[PDB]
């Protein structure tokens, strides 16, 4: 019975021909942000499928090939997620045991040209745009984002409300594995890492899925006990503080690091036949902090413009969020051509309760306090998409 790192090291040890089956190589990939949820969800899916296929649950059922879990960033970028590093360390998962974009490229390359690369999607429900020339078919989906209504024949196809995608993935596999306690012990830090970060320690965004996943982990981690002590929750709380503090730690990173470490890119279609290429970076410190750590406002904005140019963006949006003395705060910063950015912001400013504090929409760079603190990137993107649909051309 291989542990997660043992499973990953086994995959790394195999020829691509023993991973593939009948000229199909199957992967599981999260979204382009490569956050805790995307990483935990992909590894969990792949690992649980492996245990299922090898065990007695899948008797009279059959088939099953390996699924390679993919993290959709360059290998070097992993260390920018200090929370994820901590969680991987708890399970003794080494970076050299993981598969990144470089590895997926090597897989597409070192396999036969006639081999199909099929993907399970977790933590998104359409293929990441950067992988659309690598992935031939989507074969299953487990996600908790807005349903784009693609790949309707996917098996499974779970797109449902959840604090964490990881909860949905775990509960799906837990049922198939008949609650296999060893699997639960072997994945718990990864699963709980995602659930607890995504729900702020089961205090926000909680759904039935997350409650059930947590209940299941608690039962296993406690073991046989005559009564339930406070220790389990105390341990979860200490674990949460470690992961949260590390997610909140971007000291020592470059501006480019900060912009790329929790980043999503979209192309909006409008009335015009050329869409809008837009990138949104989610950041855990406020603009004044970022300026102070990066040589001041001018230097920081220069680095943002460089990032925008490098990624081919019409518009770059920075979304900051933080907590101090119990209260949430957010900011929204936009960089782009003055015409497009003015129109976009004027159309979302009421909903997002935006208040200008720096720059000028007419200059193409403007900075806003966002008093709608409930609106995350998941909400801001559709608002901007709708705003863009109303622009003329
Ligand atoms: Co996110
Ligand atoms: Co997620």
Swiss-Prot record:
Entry's Gene Ontology BP terms: polyphosphate catabolic process
Residues where Mg(2+) binds: 37, 123, 144
Top-level enzyme category: hydrolase
Residues given in the record as ATP binding sites: 145, 282, 377
Disulfide bonds: none
Molecular function terms from GO: ATP binding; exopolyphosphatase activity; metal ion binding
Keyword Repeat: no
Signal peptide (residue range): none
Family classification: Belongs to the PPase class C family.
Annotated function: Polyphosphatase (polyPase) involved in the degradation of inorganic polyphosphates (polyP) that is able to degrade a range of chains from three to several hundreds of residues in a highly processive manner. Exclusively shows exopolyphosphatase activity, cleaving inside the polyP chain.
Note: Present with 3170 molecules/cell in log phase SD medium.
Protein name per its UniProtKB record: Polyphosphatase
